[PDB]
Amino acid sequence: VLSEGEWQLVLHVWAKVEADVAGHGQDILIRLFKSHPETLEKFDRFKHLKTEAEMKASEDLKKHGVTVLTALGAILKKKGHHEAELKPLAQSHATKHKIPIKYLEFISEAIIHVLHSRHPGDFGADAQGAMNKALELFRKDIAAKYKELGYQG
Numbered sequence: 001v002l003s004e005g006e007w008q009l010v011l012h013v014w015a016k017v018e019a020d021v022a023g024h025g026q027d028i029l030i031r032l033f034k035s036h037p038e039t040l041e042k043f044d045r046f047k048h049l050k051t052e053a054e055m056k057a058s059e060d061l062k063k064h065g066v067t068v069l070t071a072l073g074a075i076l077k078k079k080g081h082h083e084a085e086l087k088p089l090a091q092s093h094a095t096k097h098k099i100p101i102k103y104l105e106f107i108s109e110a111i112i113h114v115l116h117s118r119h120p121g122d123f124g125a126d127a128q129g130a131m132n133k134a135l136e137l138f139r140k141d142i143a144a145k146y147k148e149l150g151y152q153g
């Protein structure tokens with residue numbers, strides 16, 4: 001359970017992300033695909049992209065980065081009370097997209113790296129720890145729905 005102070009650190013940096021949702025979404029997905037190429041293979045939509053420059057040039061990738069970060073921002077702003085938001089996302093990711101929980105750990109690492117690069121003054125160690133706690137809570141609650149559905153592993 002995050003404390004109020006931890007949530008304030010999370011949402012303070014997140015309000016900065018929202019100034020350029022699309023640039024953040026591109027940077028996070030590109031870092032994910034470069035750091036963990038098995039993730040790119042899950043996207044029929046993107047798996048034709050073979051270089052970082054091709055990834056940066058893809059408008060469709062930039063659009064999907066916005067989709068992803070808008071869903072995550074709506075979850076963070078619930079401060080843990082996010083059951084209604086996670087149901088459909090766990091269901092699609094487990095049963096349609098076939099995304100292991102581990103790959104959610106990988107995207108969490110990419111989010112934290114990009115927030116540290118773009119917002120160092122608002123993303124000191126206290127805020128890095130709080131965001132890590134918020135993304136761990138996200139993964140914990142998604143993993144429980146995966147397990148219900150027979151996909152935790």
Ligand code: HEM
Pocket residue numbers: 039040042043044045067068069071072088089092093097099103104107
């Ligand atoms: C912060 C974590 C993530 C969030 C908030 C998120 C959010 C979303 C949203 C909102 C959609 C569109 C609606 C839906 O299908 O449920 C989507 C689609 C999708 N996501 Fe995620 N996602 C996350 C992580 C991942 C990861 C790690 C992968 C793969 C490694 C992944 C793979 C996909 C795929 C394959 C689609 C369908 C893309 C298409 O063909 O249109 N997601 N995601």
